[PDB]
Design a protein around this ligand. Structure first.
Ligand code: AMP
Ligand code: AMP
Ligand code: PDP
Ligand code: PDP
Lengths: 801, 801
């Protein structure tokens, strides 16, 4: 040792040693030939070549944290929607061009090579994506953060459309393993389920438990060019008839979800105290032990209630294991945890039945109770005589099924609870958790969501970032508010023509991709109208459907009257066993089989379902979008980060005054936004009076006609009654008010095409939107977390090399 | 491509580079630090540094074989007892010295790191060690050979002696991963079980089968300094309730041994036909479709009957898949396979119930039946009227259970069957397989087993190799006949002095191990008396026990008679489920508890039961051995390669004229050997009169005293009747005649001790054993197979570099 260090091993980001290393990895790391390599072998080689550069920096970063002892942030989440690591590592590390030349010179095309990479199947959505944009911004802001979760071996399915219907296929992303991760067998910890608590004169004892082993995997996450590489640590379940218990064990990768919830917590928290106590540089020993500075050195950001078992667990470790006195343990737990809510919908909260916590984890139920009692006593002091307040506030819900309300726990156990959007965080204070806000207002906060400008602009849209940068430099990639500078070119004929050029190139490129994959020919001069969201009824892909049959039926009625051409691309996954979602994907495809095959349509309309929407494909479709469809019923959407992604990339939005749309439009100015339909005040008035959809049917002929086609097999001649289910629901069981927003939607849509007809004024409104999107960067959300909740100062400073 | 080459990536075999690559591996490969590295890390970083040198040479060897298209030899075995790759690879590659100096300039201790490696748990014992010594000799002799076996997830237990009794602890060697192996997920084959068979128009179809997946792992195996590095391919089982099925597919690692044998047959042969067809350098397509060349391009060595299903499987592949006609498909099979019979006993050979085969392998049974029908027709034509020979030679055995005899399958279907020692190969023709030798006599061959002069000498005994080197060059190491040149030094005092010096220094060091790992203190001047044979009754550790008690009892009786001091070491694993063997290991340790603690015995006799005997332990005790115990009943030992290990390393043999001891005494000259006891003829005489153990006991006084001591609780005070089960066995059901060779055995021991008193004559007898050991090199054995069975001429030529 001593003479063993990173000392100068990666060499240079220079094309000659970068080609050496590609060959070194093809032959010695993959034990492969030129005679036996395939595209994948060649991708792993390039992946391992960039990975040496990333790992050298990771090591100099982690070390640096132990030397300086920063406050460590553990961001705890049950999904992280990472996507593909290679180009993001190369972009973030300024390696993408030397790798491009190196690869050219060995006779390979990095574009083809990057596409053999599988998306890390570690998340299914917005929650997980937020956590992933947060990991990029925490590293670019130089914070010492960690993302801890579960390493799902087969994530949630990969979608395949067959016969226009959805199929789910196993997401076997780890089939040939994953180069970005290092498995750490030597740090497997054990987790305890079941057991019984015997008490002693000394403490509570959780005896006779079944043990699952939690094995760690590490993957670095690069900050953008600041030489900071931080850590993602994902836990894998391993078994230590026994056949059956072993399988149940491995299933962590109903009760299984409470298991994996405890698993990621128990295991992560052992690491948090392990690294706490063993504070010194060089020294692997416990050195620290007074937990008084523990709030000063550890932050646990609970992403949603899914890891709320961290609060009963941290009290249990400190009180039983470390034998601290309960009031101090709690002093330290509230000063350490914080909770992030993501919903407007009370019904949606996480409530685990006590009969199950009784079985799976007796000790934690005991601590949820001494928390609850000591809580309700404080509310009691503060609002004496208010018996129903005790009732509403109680962590334990009651009657019918006896339940623990994990949100109430998270608010009791944390020193900051925040919503994700201005109106949303108001709803938390005012109606959702009003009694927690009257008891303790100081903890409620708002941290509006953001997206990372690296993955969502300089990576996926090099062209746009390239034309912006020549005018205002590159300081905006770490300070997105500098995009307000582009307003100085809303009249520059050269910047207008360029902004427009970038989008036509991006559309041509996307058309090329769909052509070679799904083999469709779409017209790159049409308006690309994109709706990509989880296929769900409040998302109202069905309003978008009624609109494309309005367009088809319209071209048909006057086939020689001009129309701006559109390509309507809808994409997204349907929950297996959500029947209406399944029916909607099948309608989109049925509509499209008619539309795209009609020759009187010519090249004026095409409805295309984008299969297997995932982070990789969003990176293709959003740089090519001309219109963002953000049409969910007012009041159902708390945020909308995809929304912000489309605005960053030059599409214009058509949507409801809701979620992300409201702060996007105050930033953009509402005259640069196609806001339509009923606001929240209007849906509630309609709810006060009862929606009766027959009134819309009765007074709107074009809608009456569309339902008439749906009931007669126009879009399913081979099986006429197929769509009866959506027809009856739209007519009689439509909670999301589709008919009530149609007329307005089509009128707004007409305005969209009118603007599209005059390319200089569309491009000028698109400049007004790009220039005001600077607010929606996740670096701004993370500098607000850092300062208002975690109590650390973001740094834009470079670490050495 | 083309620029994508192995072209000089390895670099120099010098200390500076070796250290660069070490630092590089600990950092980028293992992602670790001086700050968190353990021994186990510094060992994986040196194993990874060396491995780069091994893989480059492997790539250029396998390219060399596709470019020359030679006859590829597949040594199919179910167990490969490889031991430990690191120093064997350093030695074979000449890296050893540079890796020592490099590790010193990095302040590490290469011998501490070498002691971290686990023994590769892929072999039970003897037959797999033979498999491993041969991999090395095929590589050293330039043969394009492959070793194909199973990749056991946890090898057979690591033995643990708790309080004299034996424990089977988990040999979970694979925990931290093995740096030598590379998993190939991309090359996973199906293996089918169960099913039914249709006979269609075009042929036969084995349908509705359970499919298990064979995924291979590749390990390089290097020849001694010739630059030929060859492949070891072991199949791993993956399942594609499938909890049950998944467990049992993973359980391949009763019906499970047949599933397990068929697994490694099926997978391996898929590769064989693959690599035959895909013959042309640079072209992966099946070029070669004409099976006429198959027997000149593939050889398959069926080691024991454990892969006998390679014969019904090749037929199935050629008749059913490749569609050859039976008669030509047979012609090809027999010319490709060869059987090696390792037994001597008729009831050790495999027989499988035909109920079990019709259910598990219905197609293979159909083929085993048509092979038998035609075989039994060949013998009917050659011996007309001989109906009991048709009964006798049939592969299908009748009587209560219809069984298939797999050794008849192997004779019928292989072009060559051989034994591993001259006597045993004669025995196969006279008794076991006489009818078969009568029908097709040309098949029967002998190939005497051998050991490898690299591991068993330049590797485990660098001092003996040093002093032989300086008198006769480095050539003996791969031409061991050159050791007879040492007979010229039989009268040379400085050689006599350095040979006895090497043994002394070797004993001195092993003494240090039995302290620093076992607490008993052995005396470096006692003759190290070693018996390490699998603990079994025919092996007669019990005779040795009767002679260690005789020495004890003699010393006690006259504590002032000079005795030569002896350290008696007995080692071997007892099969779980064999009581008598676990009683023998408990008897050994009992005598030790006594002998080693008796003050009148003083340091004159010490008994040590060496726990968890394996190849790395063997590598340490055989270099320090003075006398080699080879005492099993004449007629129970077919060969015995451990015997040869001892001869090369300076021990003399006390042994029966049986197994490897016959040809050893023959090369060394009977005078230089302590052969005692009965011969085969004498024990058969004794069996016709009746062995009556009592006769010996009644006439032998000291024996009477010993059995008295064992019944009386003398060696077991607290449990007096502990050893009465082996007493009744010795006395009344001794099947391997202990008491019948007891007095000649003890007689011969006095001759060993007497000689041991005159060191100049002992070292001269040792020079006469060592100089004659040359015959017993596995290089000789493989050159015999290559030349007489596989049809290849060994090449001792170096490949480039
Ligand atoms: N006590 C320590 N002093 C210095 N560096 C350390 C120490 N512990 C761990 N490291 C560094 O942090 C990385 C990850 O460590 P850990 O945070 O302990 O999982 C290691 O590879 C080292 O780079
Ligand atoms: N057709 C081929 N031509 C030349 N080299 C090959 C070919 N197939 C395989 N190889 C080499 O042989 C090694 C083992 O391949 P295989 O025998 O296919 O398992 C590969 O790593 C290559 O180095
Ligand atoms: C951007 C992103 C998202 C998150 O965006 P959403 O607008 O769709 O929010 P939700 O519908 O509320 O979850 C989800 N999935 C991917 C692939 C992605 O890039
Ligand atoms: C040397 C060796 C062996 C071989 O010993 P044996 O020759 O006595 O076995 P048999 O061939 O059956 O007589 C077995 N196991 C290990 C550890 C070893 O190194």
């Amino acid at each position: 040792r001593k003479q063993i260090s990173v000392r100068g091993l990666a060499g240079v980001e220079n094309v000659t040693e970068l080609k050496k290393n590609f060959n070194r990895h093809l032959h010695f790391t993959l034990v492969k030939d030129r005679n036996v390599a395939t595209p994948r072998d060649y991708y792993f080689a390039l992946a391992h070549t960039v990975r040496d550069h990333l790992v050298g920096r990771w090591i100099r970063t982690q070390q640096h944290y132990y030397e300086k002892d920063p406050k460590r942030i553990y961001y705890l989440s049950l999904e992280f929607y990472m996507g593909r690591t290679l180009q993001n590592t190369m972009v973030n590390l300024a390696l993408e061009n030397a790798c491009d030349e190196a690869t050219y010179q060995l006779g390979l095309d990095m574009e083809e090579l990057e596409e053999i990479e599988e998306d890390a199947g570690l998340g299914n959505g917005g929650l997980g994506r937020l956590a992933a944009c947060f990991l990029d911004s925490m590293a670019t802001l130089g914070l010492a953060a960690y993302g801890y979760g579960i390493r799902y071996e087969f994530g949630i399915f990969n979608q395949k459309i067959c016969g226009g219907w959805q199929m789910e296929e196993a997401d076997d992303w780890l089939r040939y393993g994953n180069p970005w991760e290092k498995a750490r067998p030597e740090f497997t910890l054990p987790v305890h389920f079941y057991g019984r608590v015997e008490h002693t004169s000394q403490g509570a004892k959780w005896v006779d438990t079944q043990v699952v082993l939690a094995m760690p995997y590490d993957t670095p996450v690069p900050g953008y060019r600041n030489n900071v590489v931080n850590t993602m640590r994902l836990w894998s379940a391993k078994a230590p008839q026994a056949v059956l218990d072993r399988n149940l064990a491995e299933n962590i990768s109903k009760e299984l979800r409470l298991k994996q919830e405890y698993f990621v917590v128990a295991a992560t928290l052992q690491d948090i105290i392990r690294r706490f106590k063993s504070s010194k540089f060089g020294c692997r020993d416990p050195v620290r032990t007074n937990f008084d500075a523990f709030p000063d050195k550890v932050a646990i950001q609970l992403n949603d209630t899914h890891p709320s078992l961290a609060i009963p667990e941290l009290m249990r470790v400190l009180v039983d294991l470390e034998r601290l006195d309960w009031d101090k343990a709690w002093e330290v737990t509230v000063k350490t945890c914080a909770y992030t809510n993501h919903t407007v919908l009370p019904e949606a909260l996480e409530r685990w039945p006590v009969h199950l916590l009784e079985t799976l984890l007796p000790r934690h139920l005991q601590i949820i109770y001494e928390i609850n009692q000591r809580f309700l006593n404080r509310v009691a002091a503060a609002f004496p005589g208010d018996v129903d307040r005790l009732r509403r506030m109680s962590l334990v819900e009651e009657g019918a099924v006896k339940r623990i309300n994990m949100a109430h726990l998270c608010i009791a156990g944390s020193h900051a609870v925040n919503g994700v959007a201005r109106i949303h965080s108001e709803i938390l204070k005012k109606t959702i958790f009003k009694d927690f806000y009257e008891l303790e207002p100081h903890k409620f906060q708002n941290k509006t969501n953001g997206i990372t400008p690296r993955r969502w602009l300089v990576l996926c849209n090099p062209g746009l970032a390239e034309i912006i940068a020549e005018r205002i430099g590159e300081e905006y990639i770490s300070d997105l508010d500098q995009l307000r500078k582009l307003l100085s070119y809303v009249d520059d004929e050269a910047f207008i023509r360029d902004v427009a050029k970038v989008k036509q190139e991006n559309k041509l490129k996307f058309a090329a991709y769909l052509e070679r994959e799904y083999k469709v020919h779409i017209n790159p001069n049409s308006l690309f109208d994109v709706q990509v969201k989880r296929i769900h009824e409040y998302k109202r892909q069905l309003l978008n459907c009624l609109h494309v049959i309005t367009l088809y039926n319209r071209i048909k009625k006057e086939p020689n009257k001009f129309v701006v051409p559109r390509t309507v691309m809808i994409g997204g996954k349907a929950a297996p066993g959500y029947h209406m979602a399944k029916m909607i994907i099948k309608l989109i495809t049925a509509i499209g089989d008619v539309v795209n095959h009609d020759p009187v349509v010519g090249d004026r309309l095409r409805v295309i379902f984008l299969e297997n929407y995932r982070v990789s494909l969003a990176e293709k479709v959003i740089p090519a979008a001309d219109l963002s469809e953000q049409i969910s019923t007012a009041g159902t959407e708390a945020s909308g980060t995809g929304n912000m992604k489309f605005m960053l990339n030059g599409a214009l939005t058509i949507g409801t005054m809701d979620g992300a749309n409201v702060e996007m439009a105050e930033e953009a100015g509402e005259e640069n936004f196609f806001i339509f339909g009923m606001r929240v005040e209007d849906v509630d008035r309609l709810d006060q009076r009862g929606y009766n959809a027959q009134e819309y049917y009765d007074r709107i002929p074009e809608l009456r006609q569309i339902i008439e086609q749906l009931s007669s097999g126009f879009f399913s001649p081979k099986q006429p009654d197929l769509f009866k289910d959506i027809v009856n629901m739209l007519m009689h069981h439509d909670r999301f008010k589709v008919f009530a927003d149609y007329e307005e939607y089509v009128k707004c849509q007409e305005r969209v095409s009118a603007l599209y007809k005059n390319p200089r004024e569309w491009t000028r409104m698109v400049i007004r939107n790009i220039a005001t999107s600077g607010k929606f960067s996740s670096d701004r959300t993370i500098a607000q977390y850092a300062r208002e909740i975690w109590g650390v100062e973001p740094s834009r400073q470079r670490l050495p090399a």
